[PDB]
Amino acid sequence: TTYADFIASGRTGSRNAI
Amino acid sequence: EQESVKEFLAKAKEEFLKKWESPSQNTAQLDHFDRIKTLGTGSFGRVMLVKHKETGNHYAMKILDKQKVVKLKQIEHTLNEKRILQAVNFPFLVKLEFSFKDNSNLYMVMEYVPGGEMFSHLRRIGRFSEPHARFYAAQIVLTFEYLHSLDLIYRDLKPENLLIDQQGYIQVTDFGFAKRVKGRTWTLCGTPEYLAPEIILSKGYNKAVDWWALGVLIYEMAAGYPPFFADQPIQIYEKIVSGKVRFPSHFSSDLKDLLRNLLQVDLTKRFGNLKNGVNDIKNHKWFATTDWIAIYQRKVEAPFIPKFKGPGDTSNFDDYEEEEIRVSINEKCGKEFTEF
Ligand SMILES: O=S(=O)(c1cccc2cnccc12)N1CCCNCC1
């Protein structure tokens, strides 16, 4: 699912600016 | 009604430009405060809950190490953030109460917003319902209308950067990437998930990048995940510029139509960048039930009120290793930070 792909991205935590 | 908006924004610009041209400096000092707890930590800076000794009022004090700021090439950004914060005035922008500097650090003392970041609430709850998302979205719309009328591009919208106050309303706090420009600008900055395609594509861009980020924000609030994600930013960038986007099946028809017009790769067709400006957004069907004036006046009942024991309650923030605030015997970087 889209949610599962989100979890698998490893980008579920707080995101830093570039 | 539109005449009231123009007159309001004209007064707002006049008040802003006055403070912008003559900023406040040195309105407190460090030993006026007791340190309570660290609320946030990152590059070059920490934010701490502090208590003003004379009054007992709690504040959030951002502390920047001048040498770390210089090392990370953040001088102009830091000076600019403080200059913006002391000059703006809007219900959803955090208020700067005091600022000062010493040998080692710069200090910005802001109103303490006890409900925490929207990010944690969103990840905890999973996703927000559409009325819940719309309540927050309406505040960002008004905030960008205000900021853009001042020729300020915000450029750092994300749930991590939105605080929830005691009444459940949003406070925007970080202005390190904001820029006052009327034309175009070229800096690659922001967070991958929220970058507009024209930023990714190294074009000169304008305030329409904030309306794109609004679409990302609305999508993530309503779905629980952003519209474009991947293992690595480069792969996120490819999705963003691709012009393709998929919606969860529970998204309403009005919501999808709004998002297609905000997540619009073509600048000539993105909402907020057209002839009627923000009114294309405020008049969209998804916002039909939104009382814009009542939102601004904070008279709408918030759909979520954070837990708040009392003044100085920090339960909505994470735990961090408490570190010393060291003030060096030698003044560091004095010439660089004269205007602070
Ligand atoms: O929550 S903060 O520590 C914070 C900053 C500024 C003012 C604050 C006011 N109250 C609480 C926390 C505050 N923070 C903002 C969110 C994004 N990361 C940077 C730091």
- The DSSP secondary-structure symbol of B93 reads B
Q: How big is the CA angle at B176 (ends B172 and B178), to the nearest 5 degrees?
A: 75
Three-state SS at B101: strand
H-run or E-run covering A2:
helix A2-8
CA distances, B20 to each of B80, B89, B282 (Å): 10, 12, 29
Measured CA to CA, the distance from residue B77 to residue B294 in angstroms comes to 34
Same domain for B44 and B17: no
CA atoms within 13 A of residue B34's CA, in its CB half-sphere: 9
Query: Which residues of B belong to the annotated binding site?
Result: 39-47, 62, 111-117, 158-161
Same domain for B78 and B198: no
* DSSP collapsed to 3 states, B285-327: HHHCCCCHHHHHCCCCCCCCCCCCCCCCCCCCCCCCCCCCCCC
Task: Retrieve residue B138's tokens.
Answer: 């309406």
Beta bridge partners of B325: none
Could you give phi then psi for residue B108, rounded to 5 degrees?
Answer: -120, 120
Any idea which residue has 């400096």 for tokens?
Answer: B25
Same domain for B332 and B215: no
Same domain for B137 and B38: no
Q: Which residues contact B220 (CB under 8 A, 6 or more apart)?
A: B122, B159, B193, B226, B227
Q: Which of B255, B277, B163, B149 is nearest to B211 (CA)?
A: B277
Contact in structure between B138 and B184 (CB atoms under 8 Å): no
Same domain for B215 and B102: no
Question: Roughly what angle, to the nearest 10 degrees, separates helices B130-149 and B2-21?
Answer: 60
Q: Which of B127, B60, B179, B249 is nearest to B136 (CA)?
A: B127
The one-letter amino acid at A13: G
B156 is catalytic: yes
Neighbour-count burial for B98-131, b at 16+ CB within 10 Å, e otherwise: bbbbbebbbbbbbbbbbbbbbbbbbbeeebbebe
Measured CA to CA, the distance from residue B115 to residue B43 in angstroms comes to 23
Contact in structure between B154 and B120 (CB atoms under 8 Å): no
Same domain for B136 and B281: yes
> Residue B166's domain is classified under what CATH number?
1.10.510.10
Three-state SS at B199: helix
Order of strands across the sheet that contains B96-101: B33-42, B45-52, B58-65, B105-111, B96-101
Q: Which of B3, B46, B106, B97 is nearest to B318 (CA)?
A: B46
CA A14 to chain centre: 9
Experimental approach: X-ray
Domain count, chain B: 2
CA B128 to chain centre: 19
CA distances, B107 to each of B59, B145, B171 (Å): 12, 29, 19
Pocket test for ligand 1, best of B157, B173, B177 (most atoms within 8 A of CB): B173
Contact A18 B188 (CB under 8 A): yes
Measured CA to CA, the distance from residue B66 to residue B268 in angstroms comes to 42
Same domain for B102 and B126: no
Q: Is the CB of B60 under 6 A from ligand 1?
A: yes
Measured CA to CA, the distance from residue B195 to residue B198 in angstroms comes to 8
Contact in structure between B225 and A4 (CB atoms under 8 Å): no
Measured CA to CA, the distance from residue B305 to residue B326 in angstroms comes to 37
User: How far from each other are the two terminal CA atoms of chain B, in whole angstroms?
Assistant: 40
CA nearest to B194 within chain A? A17
Q: Which residues contact B250 (CB under 8 A, 6 or more apart)?
A: none
Same domain for B292 and B144: yes
Q: Which of B258, B290, B256, B289 is nearest to B271 (CA)?
A: B258
Complete DSSP assignment for B263-294:
S-SSGGGSTTSSTTTTHHHHTSGGGTT--HHH
Measured CA to CA, the distance from residue B165 to residue B45 in angstroms comes to 22
Q: State the residue range of the domain holding B27.
A: 23-116+308-340
Of B188, B193, B224, the CB nearest to A15: B193
The one-letter amino acid at B288: A
Same domain for B208 and B339: no
Task: Retrieve residue B6's tokens.
Answer: 């123009």
- Residue B325 CB burial class (10 angstroms; 0-12, 13-18, ≥19): middle
- What's the resolution in A? 2.1
Measured CA to CA, the distance from residue B216 to residue B28 in angstroms comes to 39
The stretches of chain B forming alpha helices (DSSP H) are: 2-21, 66-71, 75-87, 118-125, 130-149, 197-200, 208-223, 233-242, 253-262, 279-282, 292-296
Measured CA to CA, the distance from residue B62 to residue B96 in angstroms comes to 10
Beta bridge partners of B162: B172
CA distances, A11 to each of A7, B191, B233, B236 (Å): 7, 12, 10, 11
Same domain for B278 and B153: yes
Pocket test for ligand 1, best of B46, B47, B174 (most atoms within 8 A of CB): B47
Task: Retrieve residue B258's tokens.
Answer: 């709004």
CB of A1 within 8 Å of any CB in chain B? no
Same domain for B339 and B284: no
> Residue B100's domain is classified under what CATH number?
3.30.200.20
Same domain for B97 and B154: no
Q: What percent of the residues of chain B are helix, what percent strand, and what percent coil, each to the nearest 5?
A: 40, 15, 45
Any idea which residue has 């690659």 for tokens?
Answer: B188
- Residue B269 CB burial class (10 angstroms; 0-12, 13-18, ≥19): exposed
